[PDB]
Amino acid sequence: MTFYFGYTNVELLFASLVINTPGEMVAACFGCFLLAVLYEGLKIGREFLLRRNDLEDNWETLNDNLKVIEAAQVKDALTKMRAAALDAQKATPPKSPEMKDFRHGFDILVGQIDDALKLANEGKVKEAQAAAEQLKTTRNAYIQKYQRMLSMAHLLQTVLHVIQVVVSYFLMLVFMTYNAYLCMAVAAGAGLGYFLFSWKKAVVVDIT
Amino acid sequence: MTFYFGYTNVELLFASLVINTPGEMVAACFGCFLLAVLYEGLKIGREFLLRRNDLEDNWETLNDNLKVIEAAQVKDALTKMRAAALDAQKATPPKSPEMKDFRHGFDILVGQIDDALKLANEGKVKEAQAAAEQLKTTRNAYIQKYQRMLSMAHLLQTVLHVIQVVVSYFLMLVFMTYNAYLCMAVAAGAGLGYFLFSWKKAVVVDIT
Amino acid sequence: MTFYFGYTNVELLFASLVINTPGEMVAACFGCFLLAVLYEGLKIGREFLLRRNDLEDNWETLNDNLKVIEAAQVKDALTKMRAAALDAQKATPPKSPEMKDFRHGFDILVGQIDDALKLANEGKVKEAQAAAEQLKTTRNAYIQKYQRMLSMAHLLQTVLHVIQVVVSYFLMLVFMTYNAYLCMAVAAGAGLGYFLFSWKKAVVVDIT
Ligand SMILES: [Zn+2]
Ligand SMILES: [Zn+2]
Ligand SMILES: [Zn+2]
């Protein structure tokens, strides 16, 4: 009826899956545990990829600052660009020739930025503005199109959200069986699954 | 029993709603799809309105900086105020005479700020402090009371959270029917519904 | 069957709990309301503690800036350290001799920072670098080990997430009974429970 302990005549989501022995029950419990882990890693993983897309900020920081520059306040705009250029260079698609091309474009960006600052530190204004207009040639050349990284990330995240929703309902359905062994397997799988993929995000860098 | 394909003797949440024909099933599937979309737009919409309340920051940034000013470090405090004043002016209640009054108060704020900076750039300190004390007369006049925008937003968001919770349980109950056509309708409605209201937040500005 | 109004032969999650009188029903409704509140406060409380761990930022801000310092750009690095040192001092473990020791170490940090700035404002560079190397002796002495605050917070949050997951399933199971009085009790408990613990986070400081 209602929170029972059993390994007999217990159906599990699908007509083919029924468990009538203890050895079947452990296999059912192991799967419902693993599904409960998989879910927690899915939700946390899906967030981590969403936060990494930060790129959208850096990308807007660069392009917003170019219009801000295009009157010796330019140096502060370019120092904001340099910072944004370096965090943007670290970026990588989720698990190399396009990357090596992308990364090496950003080196040229950061170098050009330093040269435009070198004019602003000496005091030269109009010339530092002319150099910044050349900067937008470089981002078009290397960085702009590869935007691919951002589109890939959004789709991947849509695909994951669907799977996250299916699994949630599936875990509701196994809990709804009212079998205390399955229910506990889910609960324990939620606890430990969260703890582990929580720990792996702490292994990767932690800011904000 | 357990993930069946059917359009016969299928009850849907309410005693009055039962579906015994395929033409009824499509109507049931269309409603459970739409409910699954509506939910995803509700959760995303409810977040977007919560992030927009940013205003709370700008409002505290202004008032925190006034006490910080009230010793030539004032210029940096007022430049923080100016930025905060302009993002605060963009704000608008969720879907005009009070607004036009509110917006036009902020113009006067930003202008007064520039005049207090003009003293600080020349080097004049005590006079730039006296001008800032007049700034708090202006926010009281126009901005302060209209705080209404913030209270409206919090209540709206409470109202939405309730509806978000009802719908979630309702979608659990339709999935719990174990009818594979309804279950799929929800799952598909979660996928596409998320994708669309995800896309509309990308249509609106994207920072942080 | 399907959204019924009743106080007769209604079972509630456990074989021992069955309700056959109206006076039992109110007790069931009060418990399912309270569980619905408790859940909302759990989710919001669990977030508030996660945001407070901010400390991780300040802690990395200090240690990142020390390597940045160890060429008169040091003053801006130390002013970032001072800010980070003061928000870090406000911190406290969730509900005093270790604290008084921890807080008083941070005073010494902020004072040492001011002295290193006093050299940078006069123009002295190499000496301001030598003072910063002494700063890392002080954090080791007082702050570093008490990291305990951070580890305590992560475990507490793991413990809460488990309980949050159990309660969610439990509230699904009471809603699944299809008793309109229990269902409403949950829905109302979600509405009001959210509103209150939403209001208490607004009582505590609100930034970002
Ligand atoms: Zn979770
Ligand atoms: Zn979703
Ligand atoms: Zn909620």
Residue numbers in the entry:
A (entry chain A), B (entry chain A), C (entry chain A): 41 to 93, 1002 to 1018, 1023 to 1047, 1055 to 1105, 121 to 182
Sentences reproduced from the published study:
Experimental phases to 3.4 Å resolution were calculated from a single-wavelength anomalous diffraction experiment with a Ta6Br12-derived crystal. Essential for Cu+ uptake activity, two strictly conserved methionine residues in an MX3M sequence motif in TM2 (M146 and M150 in sCtr1) form two layers of methionine triads, constituting a potential Cu+ selectivity filter at the extracellular entrance. Interestingly, the last four amino acids in the C-terminus, including the HCH motif, are the only segment of sCtr1cryst not resolved in the electron density map, implying a structurally flexible C-terminal tail.
The high-affinity Cu transporter Ctr1 (Km ≈ 2 μM), an integral membrane protein localized to the plasma membrane and endosomal vesicles, mediates cellular Cu uptake in eukaryotes from fungi, insects, plants, fish and vertebrates, thus playing a broad but unique role in biology. To provide a molecular understanding of Cu+ conduction by Ctr1, we determine the X-ray crystal structures of an engineered Salmo salar Ctr1 protein, revealing an ion channel-like architecture, and unambiguously identify two Cu+ binding sites along the permeation pathway using X-ray anomalous diffraction.
